[PDB]
Structure 1
Amino acid sequence: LAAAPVMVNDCTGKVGQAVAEAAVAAGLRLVPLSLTGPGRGGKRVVIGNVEVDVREVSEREDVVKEVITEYPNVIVVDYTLPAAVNDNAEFYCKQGLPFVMGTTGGDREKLLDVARKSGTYSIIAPQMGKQVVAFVAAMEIMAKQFPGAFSGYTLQVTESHQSTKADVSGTALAVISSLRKLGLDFKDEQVELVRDPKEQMTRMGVPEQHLNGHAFHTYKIISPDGTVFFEFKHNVCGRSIYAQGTVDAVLFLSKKIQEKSEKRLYNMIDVLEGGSM
Structure 2
Amino acid sequence: AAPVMVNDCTGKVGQAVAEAAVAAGLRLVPLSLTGPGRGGKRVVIGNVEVDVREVSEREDVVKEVITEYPNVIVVDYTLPAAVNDNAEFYCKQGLPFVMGTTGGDREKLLDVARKSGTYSIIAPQMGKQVVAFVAAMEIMAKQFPGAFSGYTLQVTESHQDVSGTALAVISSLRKLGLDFKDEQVELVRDPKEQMTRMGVPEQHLNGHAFHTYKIISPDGTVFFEFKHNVCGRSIYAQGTVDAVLFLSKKIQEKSEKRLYNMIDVLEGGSMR
Bin of the TM-score, shorter chain as denominator length: over 0.9
In structure 2, the residue corresponding to 1:53 is in which secondary structure? Answer: strand
Alignment gaps of 5+ in structure 1: none
Q: CA deviation at 1:240?
A: 1.0
Q: CA deviation at 1:148?
A: 2.2
Please say which of residues 180-189 and 56-65 is displaced more in the overlay: 180-189
Q: CA deviation at 1:95?
A: 1.2
1:33 equivalent among 31, 34, 44: 31
Q: CA deviation at 1:182?
A: 1.9
Q: TM-score, normalised by structure 1?
A: 0.93
Q: CA deviation at 1:173?
A: 2.1
Q: CA deviation at 1:107?
A: 2.3
Q: Which residue of 2 aligns with 1:155?
A: 153
Q: Which residue of 2 aligns with 1:187?
A: 181
Q: CA deviation at 1:82?
A: 2.0
Rate the CA distance shift 1:140–1:53 in 2: closer, same or farther, 3 A: same
Alpha-carbon distance in 1 for matches of 2:154, 2:184: 8
Do 1:127 and 1:171's aligned partners in 2 also have CA atoms closer than 8 Å? no
Do 1:158 and 1:193's aligned partners in 2 also have CA atoms closer than 8 Å? yes
Alpha-carbon distance in 1 for matches of 2:237, 2:244: 11
CA deviation map 1:128-155 (0-9, x unaligned)? 1111111111101111211222223222
When the two chains are superposed, the root-mean-square deviation of aligned CA atoms in Å is 1.4
Q: CA deviation at 1:246?
A: 0.8
CA deviation map 1:235-273 (0-9, x unaligned)? 011111111111111011001001100111111111111
In structure 2, the residue corresponding to 1:35 is in which secondary structure? Answer: strand
1:15 equivalent among 7, 13, 16: 13
Please say which of residues 15-24 and 191-200 is displaced more in the overlay: 191-200
Q: CA deviation at 1:76?
A: 0.6
Please say which of residues 244-253 and 178-187 is displaced more in the overlay: 178-187
Please say which of residues 263-272 and 35-44 is displaced more in the overlay: 35-44
Alpha-carbon distance in 1 for matches of 2:175, 2:110: 26
Q: TM-score, normalised by structure 2?
A: 0.94
In structure 1, the residue corresponding to 2:218 is in which secondary structure? Answer: coil
Please say which of residues 109-118 and 17-26 is displaced more in the overlay: 109-118
Q: Which residue of 2 aligns with 1:203?
A: 197
Q: CA deviation at 1:169?
A: 2.0
Q: Which residue of 2 aligns with 1:130?
A: 128
Moved over 6 A (4+): none
Do 1:10 and 1:16's aligned partners in 2 also have CA atoms closer than 8 Å? yes
Alpha-carbon distance in 2 for matches of 1:7, 1:227: 54
In structure 2, the residue corresponding to 1:204 is in which secondary structure? Answer: coil
Q: CA deviation at 1:106?
A: 2.2
Rate the CA distance shift 1:208–1:95 in 2: closer, same or farther, 3 A: same
Alpha-carbon distance in 2 for matches of 1:58, 1:182: 52
CA deviation map 1:89-133 (0-9, x unaligned)? 122111111111112222222222221111110111111111111
Alpha-carbon distance in 2 for matches of 1:221, 1:76: 42
Do 1:35 and 1:60's aligned partners in 2 also have CA atoms closer than 8 Å? yes
Q: CA deviation at 1:179?
A: 1.6
Please say which of residues 94-103 and 143-152 is displaced more in the overlay: 143-152
Do 1:155 and 1:221's aligned partners in 2 also have CA atoms closer than 8 Å? yes
In structure 2, the residue corresponding to 1:147 is in which secondary structure? Answer: coil
Confirm whether residue 232 of structure 1 aligns to residue 226 of structure 2. Answer: yes
In structure 2, the residue corresponding to 1:28 is in which secondary structure? Answer: coil
Q: CA deviation at 1:225?
A: 3.0
Please say which of residues 250-259 and 105-114 is displaced more in the overlay: 105-114
